[PDB]
Design a protein around this ligand. Structure first.
Ligand SMILES: COc1cc2cc(c1OC)OC[C@H](C)OC/C=C/[C@H](O)[C@@H](C)OC(=O)[C@@H]1CCCCN1C(=O)[C@H]2C1CCCCC1
Length: 126
């Protein structure tokens, strides 16, 4: 399924090249611009423990957050910063770029690998 595909074929978009954040572009977007730190970002997302979703659709509204402001896990700040408007991307994320050894119960156990599908709807400058 989609997580194994990202393990097998995903790009490593981490600076350290530790495979902590792996990406596949599943639908291409438009525009020379990706979001940069500070931007308000609008997404729809499906996310799940890679073991086997929480989704923005469940709540019938987009998920809204400021990039690089620590409002989302590291893997999002890194991953979404690579995405173009209208893009759909799959991310697979080792715990070091999500909730770590501590976890975040009850939803996230210690040392959890996470998978998302993200659609970048829009972004606006600070
Ligand atoms: C660990 O806590 C949660 C994790 C996740 C979703 C949670 C959640 O309860 C606070 O509830 C949904 C509400 C709307 O979210 C508000 C804020 C989310 C924040 O931005 C943080 C907590 O979430 C994140 O940084 C990431 C990325 C953005 C979307 C939420 N995500 C999650 O880790 C999900 C998580 C995904 C794996 C399946 C279980 C839910």
């Amino acid at each position: 399924g989609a997580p194994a595909t990202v393990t097998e074929q995903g790009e490593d978009i981490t600076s350290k090249k530790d495979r902590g954040v792996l990406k596949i572009v599943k639908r291409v977007g438009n525009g020379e611009e990706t979001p940069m730190i500070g931007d308000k970002v609008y997404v729809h997302y499906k996310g799940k423990l890679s073991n086997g979703f929480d989704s923005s659709h469940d709540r019938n509204e987009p998920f809204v957050f400021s990039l690089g402001k620590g409002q989302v896990i590291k893997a999002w700040d890194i991953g979404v910063a690579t995405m173009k408007k209208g893009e759909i991307a799959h991310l697979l994320i080792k715990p070091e770029y999500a909730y770590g050894s501590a976890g975040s119960l009850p939803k996230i156990p210690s040392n959890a690998t996470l998978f998302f599908e993200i659609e970048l709807l829009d972004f606006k400058g600070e």
